[PDB]
Design a binder for these strands. Structure first.
Length: 49
DNA sequence: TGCACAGGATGTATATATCTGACACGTGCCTGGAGACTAGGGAGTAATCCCCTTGGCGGTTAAAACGCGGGGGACAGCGCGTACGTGCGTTTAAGCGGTGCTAGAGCTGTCTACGACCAATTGAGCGGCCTCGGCACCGGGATTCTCCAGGGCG
């Protein structure tokens, strides 16, 4: 359509000037890995103790 | 003389034959069950067109949203007294057993108006249209209507 062209270009025009595209830059927090392999051996430590 | 006893003279729950009421079982005539013919009413499709959306920038306005003062009205506390709450004896009248009736409730033939079912006309009622006089909104101005400050009065 003629509307899809304009609405598709408004996102590039929402970029080139400033990153207005939702402008989400990750805060770069660390990884979320919850396993903590030693916790799996915690029970074995309890039984042996 | 004062006293215990042996038997009659009354009660009383106890056990037995007896009187309603309701559940249980055996019928036969107006119901249902079912078989066939008709057919128009229901399931299915081919355009269609028509108002209803798609997505989001801005500019501006009217409506929504927040914020504080305090004024009056909701609301707690408390005393009063008369208006029902509670308890007696005394009365009028419904409950109930039983009775003589009837006049209106209730099931059944006759036919006869009289409304169900079906062609032919049309005209009065419905789709379409295009105006103007009543209607929408607001100024002008008079009128009322409430709000606040003495002050004459306690």
């Amino acid at each position: 359509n003629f509307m899809s062209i304009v609405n598709c270009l408004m996102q590039l025009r929402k970029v080139c000037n400033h990153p207005n595209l939702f402008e989400v830059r990750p805060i770069l927090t660390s990884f979320v890995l919850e396993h903590c392999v030693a916790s799996d051996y915690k029970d074995v430590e309890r039984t042996l103790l």
